[PDB]
Amino acid sequence: HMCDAFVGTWKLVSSENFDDYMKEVGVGFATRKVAGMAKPNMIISVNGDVITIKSESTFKNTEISFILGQEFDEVTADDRKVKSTITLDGGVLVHVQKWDGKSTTIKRKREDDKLVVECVMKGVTSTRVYERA
Numbered sequence: 001h002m003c004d005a006f007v008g009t010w011k012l013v014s015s016e017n018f019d020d021y022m023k024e025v026g027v028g029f030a031t032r033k034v035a036g037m038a039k040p041n042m043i044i045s046v047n048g049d050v051i052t053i054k055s056e057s058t059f060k061n062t063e064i065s066f067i068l069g070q071e072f073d074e075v076t077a078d079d080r081k082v083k084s085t086i087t088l089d090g091g092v093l094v095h096v097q098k099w100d101g102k103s104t105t106i107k108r109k110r111e112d113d114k115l116v117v118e119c120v121m122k123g124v125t126s127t128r129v130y131e132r133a
């Protein structure tokens with residue numbers, strides 16, 4: 001019953017500061033513009049101890065499966081090759097990505113009927129709000 005309130009299909013409804021977050025991470029101009037238009041569907045499921053998060057959009061389709069606390073390799077939608085660890089901290093999914101001596105953290109939280117995604121790179125935060133699909 002790990003992660004029950006996250007499971008489901010979610011659709012992006014608002015974004016703030018995502019272009020700047022992508023700049024801070026190192027994403028180039030053309031990718032930022034096309035990625036920033038996307039309105040992904042995020043599909044979260046659990047089977048035993050394995051959590052799967054899929055993102056489907058007209059920019060990219062991604063899929064990660066993982067066990068909490070257990071590092072895994074990930075190729076991000078912007079084509080970074082990162083080492084990721086996802087944990088639950090106080091009911092918040094905390095996803096840390098490490099590459100080239102850099103680090104970014106993506107937090108996913110249930111707030112009212114929404115799923116709120118906060119992405120942080122250095123001093124730059126972006127907030128992305130998803131609704132049930």
Ligand SMILES: COc1cccc(SCc2nc(C(=O)O)cs2)c1
Pocket residue numbers: 022035038040042055059076077078106117119128
């Ligand atoms: C989601 O699409 C893109 C496009 C280009 C870079 C990235 S970095 C990974 C992140 N995914 C979200 C999220 O809202 O699910 C926020 S941060 C993602």
